[PDB]
Every structure is written in C-alpha cells, then in structure tokens.
Design a protein around this ligand. Structure first.
Ligand SMILES: *[C@@H](O)[C@H](C[C@@H]1CCNC1=O)NC(=O)[C@H](CC(C)C)NC(=O)O[C@H]1CC[C@H](CCC)CC1
Ligand SMILES: *[C@@H](O)[C@H](C[C@@H]1CCNC1=O)NC(=O)[C@H](CC(C)C)NC(=O)O[C@H]1CC[C@H](CCC)CC1
Lengths: 299, 299
C-alpha cells in the first residue's frame, strides 16, 4: 500500500511556458486558452504589495511570451479572472483532453504535476488540508503547476500553485483563480491556522492496513460517535459524522470491522501512541488517503 | 520534500493488454515487439511448477491476443527470453519513445506505472532493495507493469513485475527477463533474505531534511568511516564507502555539513531513536531517496 498518483500523460500535454518580462512560470493550455498565475506580471520589486489591476494595464498581448516546446504561441487576448490570467491564443491545443474545472473539498486528494519552465519534473499525491493548505514540493519557478484527478477519460483540474507559507506548506487557487483558504497572492508571511487531522482518512488508512495484513492495533473495545469525538476534539481531529461512517461502510464490510470498533482502536492509538510499532510501514497516523483512494488501490 | 515519480506519459503510450487463454496481463509495446511476463501462458493449475518450455510449445502466434485500446494487434512471431516473452507484431508502436533497457543496481530508485488490463492505474516511486526486492503496490492482473527512469527525452526501462513474496514485497525482472535476485517465476513461497538499509540514501535524506529547515538531529560529534560501519553492521545498514562519501559531496557542500558529521548524527539516531520527534514528516529513517533524487528535488 503506497501513496500513488494518477498517470500524468494527459496533463503533460497541456503544460506550456509563460514569460512576462523576466518572470517565467507555467501555464495550462486547454482549447485556445492558456491559464496561469497572475503574478507572472510582477517584477521582484512588485511582489511585496502588488496592485495587479495597475500592473496589468501596462501589459499588452505581445508582452506575454507563451512557448510550447520549440513553438511560440501567438497571444490574441488577455483577461484577469480573480488570481489567474487567461491568455487567448491563436491555436487550440491539439492535445486537449476531456476536462473540467472543479473546486475540491477539504479532505480530498489530488495529484500534482510539478513543472518548471513549462516542463514536467515529477508527479505526487496531495490532500487539500482542512485549513486549505497542501504539503507539496515546490521550488521557485513551479507556480502554474496544477493538481488534478482523473475520472475515466476525464481530467478534473482542481488546483494551480501560487505560493509558500511560513510553515513550508503551500497555497493556491482553483482554475477560476479563487484561492483555497484565506490567502492572497502577495509576498508576505500569512497564517493558515490550526491544521486538523482528517479523521475519516485516518480510518480509511487503518482499514487499508488491515486489508494488507497489518492488524496489531485492533482491540476488544468499541465506542460511540459522541465519545470518540470528545477524544477527536482533544487531538485536533475533525469530528466524525454519520456520513463519514457510511462512506467507510464498504471498507467496514470488506474487513468485517465495525466503524466504531475501528474508532475505538484509533482512540487507543491516539491516547497511547504506537509503542515503537508501525502501520503500513509508517510510525505516524496517515490522513492523506481518502476511502475512495483506499478502495481504488485495493482493487 | 516528497516521494516523487517521473511523469508517466511516455510510458502510458506503450502499455497494451496480452491475453493467452483466460490469463490476461500487461505488455510493453516498443517498435514492433511486445514484451510481457512469460507466465501469461500458464493456467491457474500450471503456476505451482510450470515447465515453461513445454507449455510454450503448445502455443502458436494466434493464441496471443494483444489489444491496444480498441485495436487488436496481429502477432507474427514469438520467442521466450529468460522469464519474458517477446511477441513480434505487425505494427510498430507510433508512440514508441526514445528508450533503452537497463539493469539497475541495488540502492537505485525508479518509477512504477502500475497497470491492469493494459490500462495505467497509478504511478509511484520505488527502490531496488539490497536484497533485490521492491516494496510495491500490486494486485492480481498487475504483472507486466514496468519500472523506469527518464533521462532527458529517453526512457530507461529497468523492471517488469512478476510476483509477490511471503513478506508482501515484490520481485520481477529486467526487460531481458532476468530476475533481480534469486527468485523464480513459480507460485511458491520464496526467501529474499535479510533486508539491509541503504545507508547512503538515508544520509541523502538527512541532507534533504537539513535543506528543508529540519535540523534538530545534528550534533557536535563526528566519527570515522570504520567506526560508523561498526555501528552500521549492527543495525543491518550497508557499509559506507569513500565512493558514497564522494557521491554525497555536493549535498555536503550545499549544506556545509561534513559527511562524517552527518554520519555521527545518524549513529545517534540509530542508537537513540527519534524520541518521538520527526524528520521531514516521518518518524522513521527513509532510505528510498538517492543523492541524485535529493539533488533533483531541491533544484
Ligand atoms: C511561484 O511563482 C512561487 C512558488 C513559491 C516559491 C518558493 N516556494 C513556493 O511555493 N511563488 C512565489 O514566489 C510567491 C509570489 C507571490 C507574489 C504570489 N511568493 C511566495 O511564495 O512568497 C513566500 C515565500 C516564503 C515566505 C516565508 C516567510 C517566513 C512567505 C512568502
Ligand atoms: C501477476 O501475474 C501476479 C502478481 C502478484 C499477484 C498478487 N500480487 C502480486 O504481486 N503474479 C502472480 O500471481 C505470480 C505468478 C507466478 C507463476 C509467477 N504468483 C505469485 O506471485 O504467487 C505468490 C502469491 C503470494 C504467496 C505468498 C505465500 C505466503 C507466494 C506466491
């Protein structure tokens, strides 16, 4: 049982390079539109307190250099939507996959295709944390890299990368340019607030551990939803709801372990730690696998 | 800092479905050859003790059904090379990337494109362990999935998946069909022997931790190569050689931390554990990042 990303080929064919002045970052080319972070128009001496409307007024279509491999694309229109720029180009991407834009919920996962200069470097799996940050791996030049899910043949884009927070975690927008969380695109230290653990995902992962033979943490206790949550609150775990219980139903069925029994085991793990033991090769409780992720990987 | 796989698009275009009888698994289609595990010719009542030469003699070209999406490929020749079958087909793969076959060394990493029925399901990063197993995520139907590295435009294929061992780890071949390690393709419980920790990779990861602000494990001690190795041997760590020291040179330079100083810190971690603390979000010492991986991800 592994942290697995979606195959990235459909997205690789959409990445381009966008340059305004000496600033370069990544854009996403779908149909005849290229989407990228609006701070591509900033110089280094703009990023502390940018007035994006005023900065963009000085820019014309020909100030945006868009490159797909050896080919320069011709920009024929531009507009700003929230924190993203949309550059209309004279060529529809022949590699455009079936796609949609979605705004994902906290607790859900997605794959990131980290890119530099329009070129894919690697792919990994992330969760949108309750506090609307992600724990990525991003360097200068990585903005405009995107997060996505694949649903059959269809790519659902849910994230575009914009910035780092003081804790080393990351923040960005949906593909309409609206940040996840309270963040703004300027070069200041910003607060994400308490991060809470995604309880339903921890339980999914404990189920995955059982499926994979690792079963030492199970016990002879059970609990109630209200009583577990008294312990969840204590550890900054999200409260568990009945909807979560029913989402875990299939995993509970495949293992024959009642959800509230697994909850009792989680309580003991939370209160007693792992006593140097491990679960699926980890000495920490993992919360970046959804139930759907766990079902996907054990089928 | 994240476990990151290579972008998988160039490999996605090479995966096909291979069916012999009711057995189906994955094949790799490059030029006019499809490569797949030879046990595609086995029935369930063959896999305990297969005589592959005798089984293959009963098979003709038209007994191999090869499907790339909606398209059936026509098999015009077949031969067995070690534990792989080579099916010559009447169509060269138009998506064949620049590629080569390499036999990778223990301690090196590669990306796995896990596939079922010829269709990519997900991508993750693995290491070839010292004992020539890998810790993958593979289900029935996953054989013929491949591991690879990408070097510029060129895909280096290094692994094809064949089996599970009793410890839940995995074993397979290079693309010439030669197993890594002592394993054979038959459905028996087989021994991998003691797994040792890839010391140079643990040090690379400790350097990555320093680069990423996490520095509590550093100390005021140093050591010698011989004296550390006395402690490496104890914990089933690979001995550190001067070649490893020089491989770590660049990371040592970027951090200004002498390799033998980092070794002294590792010794303390090995002898004292992590006292409930964490390193790059892990409560265990990670050994599946090479120095090159760490350089790649911090650039
Ligand atoms: C992409 O352009 C880039 C991505 C980050 C660079 C370092 N890692 C990243 O994730 N974004 C920025 O540089 C961004 C530009 C803004 C105008 C949107 N600025 C940014 O992330 O500034 C951060 C740097 C770290 C700092 C930490 C304080 C302790 C907070 C501001
Ligand atoms: C692909 O065909 C498949 C992959 C494995 C299935 C389960 N997980 C895998 O990695 N290979 C096999 O089924 C393989 C066929 C052989 C003829 C090569 N057999 C196999 O892996 O048998 C294993 C199953 C587990 C068992 C554990 C003993 C405690 C040892 C034999």
């Amino acid at each position: 049982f592994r942290k697995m990303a979606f195959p990235s080929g459909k997205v690789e064919g959409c990445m381009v390079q966008v340059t305004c002045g000496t600033t370069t970052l990544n854009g996403l080319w779908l149909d005849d539109v290229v989407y990228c972070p609006r701070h591509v128009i900033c110089t280094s001496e703009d990023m502390l307190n940018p007035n994006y409307e005023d900065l963009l007024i000085r820019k014309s279509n020909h100030n945006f250099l868009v490159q797909a491999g050896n080919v320069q694309l011709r920009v024929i229109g531009h507009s700003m939507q929230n924190c993203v720029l949309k550059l209309k180009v004279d060529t529809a991407n022949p590699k455009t996959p079936k796609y949609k834009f979605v705004r994902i919920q906290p607790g859900q996962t997605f794959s990131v295709l980290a890119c530099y200069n329009g070129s894919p470097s690697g792919v990994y799996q992330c969760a949108m944390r309750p506090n609307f940050t992600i724990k990525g791996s991003f360097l200068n030049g990585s903005c405009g890299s995107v997060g996505f899910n694949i649903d059959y043949d269809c790519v659902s884009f849910c994230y575009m990368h914009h910035m780092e927070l003081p804790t080393g975690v990351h923040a960005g927008t949906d593909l309409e340019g609206n940040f996840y969380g309270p963040f703004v695109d300027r070069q200041t230290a910003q607060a994400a607030g308490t991060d809470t653990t995604i309880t339903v995902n921890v339980l999914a992962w404990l189920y995955a551990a059982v499926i994979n033979g690792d079963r030492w943490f199970l016990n002879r206790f059970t609990t109630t939803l209200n009583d577990f949550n008294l312990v969840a609150m204590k550890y900054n775990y999200e409260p568990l709801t009945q909807d979560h219980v029913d989402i875990l139903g299939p995993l509970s069925a495949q293992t024959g372990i009642a959800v509230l029994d697994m909850c009792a085991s989680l309580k003991e793990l939370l209160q007693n730690g792992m006593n140097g033991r491990t679960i699926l090769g980890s000495a920490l409780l993992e919360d970046e696998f959804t139930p759907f992720d766990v079902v996907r990987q054990c089928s």
